[model samples]
Target chain A: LCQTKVLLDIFTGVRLYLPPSTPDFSRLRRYFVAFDGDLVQEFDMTSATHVLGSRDKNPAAQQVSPEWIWACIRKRRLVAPS
Target chain B: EPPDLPVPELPDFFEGKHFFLYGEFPGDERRRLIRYVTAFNGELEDRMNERVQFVITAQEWDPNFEEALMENPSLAFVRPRWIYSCNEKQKLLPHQLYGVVPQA
Candidate 1:
């Protein structure tokens, strides 16, 4: 059973875009369910606040490591991208 | 007998909302859910229709849900946790957090 209390709105106002080539892309999407981030598709990239993947794979100004997602969840709030 | 003033009506969170159970719920779970909804003044629909505002289901995602959305994009497809959470908190919680996300 899913615990609603633990699914906090830590990712509120975050519009996340996950590159299709990102490792474990599907699995990462599952983790987003616990937060309020919007999982945007390719066509909606312009509206995305953060692109999740390695900088080498996606050379976007807002690109951050997928691990950043885990970090935010652990801290229960948005953390700076490494 | 004293003169009757306007009878005050208590408010309910689900007062005007109508819910439809999307699929089969195991054992007495469905009945228990029905009890919870009715207790909160929410109405139950035997079948999905334009009048239904919410569709509560146990499944993570279903093709039928997407089809239903085509008919009424306004319908909110949420999980059973939403009801329990609202009941626990004694108020209606945001339905977006409890949405039934389609599997990737």
Candidate 2:
């Protein structure tokens, strides 16, 4: 059995987790901000990885902070794309 | 686990919040935690995630827990009492009071 559940709440039904020190962000960067409908203008969206909680190496799967998640929940717009 | 204890009707104090259980919640401890949370209408998450607001365990730094924390920084790595106290008070208590300090 998968020992621990990595975050079960699915944003639009899915959230992906990839550790730091891993060449994974580049692969998924395009998808992170795949949608423009919920875009925040002039918020410096360049470093999408940082917005998703990839702050330091060996980060966990649901890198996005709870505050960010809550903010999204309250406003119904994700800081990072789905 | 033994038969679940009868639960008290509790408010949805943990509405929109979820949790996961981690290390050293021996025997009835796990069952007790689950029951209390459920009784209080708290969502018990089976895995870790941004949706999972809390990770409840007595043991502080379950190495992997640290990794989960890094990735899920918002995840409140708290103790079993966080649940018990929440139930007793009928509201989610501030985690810092029951939260374990991370292992350095």
Candidate 3:
């Protein structure tokens, strides 16, 4: 299953890792300033990519283009890499 | 891939400011690099400026070059040797990757 989460704390952004790139952390969240609104929204954006991620690791289907993401970054925005 | 702020109509500043991501990474190291970049973006403040513009990696030459460049046009991936090659297009110049953010 797809396991990852990008968490927020007060004004601080903390991304917990899961699916353990190591051993315990199985879920992870990629936190970026969506620039649209709240950081929690990243969960929603990330969820939209669930279907593709379930099928492939690269996840080229859910619209998470590196080009797009970098653009967002350029504009001071962020989101998980579904 | 949109802007955070309204994109200051005139955008008085934010041009030609290069923030490079210099480090060593391999094509196979995508996941790890993604996570690192995630945290990099996550940790940095949500504002573009001269201090943090580009993410350039000074890695082993050859193969990795293609993958990095293929990733995006905004991101200018170049080799150490290529830096002095003098080809602006093939190997980006320092000014080529300017930080959109302003200086203090």
Candidate 4:
């Protein structure tokens, strides 16, 4: 059996039949970056650079394509890390 | 041998944002998550670091995942759908809208 459970090619593009209750990106960001877990210790992702997968957890297997990352970056959609 | 494929350049849309991924996801699910972040012009970190702003996971109940959370009390663990949903609107949505029910 394949190690991963979902079936998506996040690279080409992501389109989900999302439910109406889905939260706004900005609101989700607030929860995503808070340090104190209280939403009080604010954080920012705008200026930051880099996105990582679980290499340490499972260095042997990954269900992602580095090429997609390359294409996405080469297209000027993402900026290189500092 | 065929000519070498041109290298793919990362995007600038997310020249501002970055994220980290963990837990289980199906074929394309992982890719989709990565794509959403990049498509939206966000960055994808390869490992855990001080700069990592978000941690998207499929299994928060795992011992290792739970352990890491304890150590990094500052990090936020979100569902993959958050990216999927966020990309749909082209703006941030309320996290409350996508809450997952805990398993016993």
Candidate 5:
């Protein structure tokens, strides 16, 4: 029975968009929910705070590494996409 | 009297982070890592989930690891040294430097 009072809210207020065929689609969806992130099914640059994909695929400024989700979860805070 | 031990200056360095141990570890290294993570405010996950960020492993590659990645591409497969490095630096270091690249 592991126990901790830590509450992860790093993704709060973040509107994230992941394109179709994203790996671990459901898993990432659940993760975003747990951390209080809003995962939009459709991509809308005007409303999205972060877009998950490869730069080569979409060079928009909002585009970020899909790994950014893990980074944010690991660091317990939002991190810049690399 | 108990001897003074070094208190973590950045107790919340791993505040919201969660780690999952993969592959075999020598001796009590696994327990030692758990201790270090907890000391630094990191959480240990019993199962893989979105909550789990880093997958600490000793092996460079494993079929199970590939499955894990397929399940969660966001998961970072890093060596235990990454944890120690963060402890030594008193801050979270980039995991990419300590990544466990799968052998071709």
Candidate 6:
């Protein structure tokens, strides 16, 4: 059953990014590279990157998506890890 | 095609803080406990507050508590427990029971 959250594309795999404050963003940096960062250029997202919810309804059934990768990197608003 | 997505990243507390509690808790409560833990991570203490913290019994660890202790030993701080209400003050906290070192 869907909860109180708004439904986005569902294929976008909706994320929940509350207005990330400076301290929050600063604190969030620990998830990746211990404060290190690696940017995703456009081409990295285009031809070379993978797509989400395509190969199977279950991500575990296929390669992980660039969308998930980006969500993790840039910060997302509503998706959750399974 | 997957929607044009942003770069992927992980969060800090997902990488930073270790979340845990001290208690002799029931097995049925872990699912909700774990869900909240996954969501809040470092903020778990404030979330569970005193509910998940100070409930201790002298009983030996059952399978569930054993698994819990193994998973969160680092998060626990042992204490000398006595069944007293909030009004009781002469007793020390459980953390003091075994000398509050880092959780096992």
TM-scores for chain B, in order?
A: 0.83, 0.77, 0.24, 0.67, 0.82, 0.27
lDDT of 6 by residue, A1-82 (tens): 1222211222232222211232344333223212122212233433222233344323333233334433544443323432
lDDT of 3 by residue, A1-82 (tens): 1112222221123221122132221112333221211222233444332221233432433433333333444454345543
Q: Which segments of candidate 3 are over 4 A away from where they belong?
A: A1-82, B1-25, B40-55, B60-104
**What does the lDDT come to for candidate 6?**
0.33
DockQ of each: 0.01, 0.02, 0.14, 0.06, 0.02, 0.12
Give the top-scoring candidate (DockQ).
3
Candidate 3 CAPRI assessment class: incorrect
Please provide, for model 2 over A1-82, each residue's C-alpha lDDT reduced to its tens digit, 9 standing for 90 to 100. 1213111121343333433333443223222222111111223344223334454432332355435543443454445533
Between candidates 2 and 4, name the one with more favorable lDDT.
2
Local distance difference test values of all predictions, in order: 0.70, 0.52, 0.33, 0.45, 0.68, 0.33
Ranking of all predicted structures according to lDDT, beginning with the best and ending with the worst: 1, 5, 2, 4, 6, 3
Off by over 4 Å in 2: A1-82, B1-9
Best by lDDT: 1
Expressed as tens digits, the lDDT of each residue in A1-82 for candidate 5 is 1123233566787877766577876456545654567656453544676777744433454676657777777676777775
Tens digits of per-residue lDDT for model 1, A1-82: 3344323555677777888788876445545533456667677777777887645433554776777877776676677885
DockQ metric, candidate 5: 0.02
lDDT of 1 by residue, B1-98 (tens): 22323311222668758899988888867755664565566777869998899999987788877788787899898888888887678677898989
For each of the candidates, the C-alpha root-mean-square deviation to the true structure, in angstroms, is: 18.0, 16.7, 16.6, 15.8, 15.6, 14.5
Candidate 5 residue-pair clash tally = 0
Model 3 is docked with a DockQ of 0.14
Tens digit of per-residue lDDT, candidate 3, span B1-104: 44453221111121333434455556634333333334323222233333443443444334533444454445444333332222223223353443222123
The weakest ten consecutive residues by lDDT in model 3 chain B span B6-15
Error of 5 at B12 (Å): 1.5
Candidate 2 DockQ category?
Answer: incorrect
lDDT string for model 4 (B1-104, tens) is 23333432222334556688876687768755754575556666778765666677776445555556566766556788887777555467655565433457
Assess every candidate by TM-score. Answer: 0.49, 0.47, 0.20, 0.44, 0.49, 0.24
Off by over 4 Å in 6: A1-60, A66-82, B1-16, B21-28, B43-104
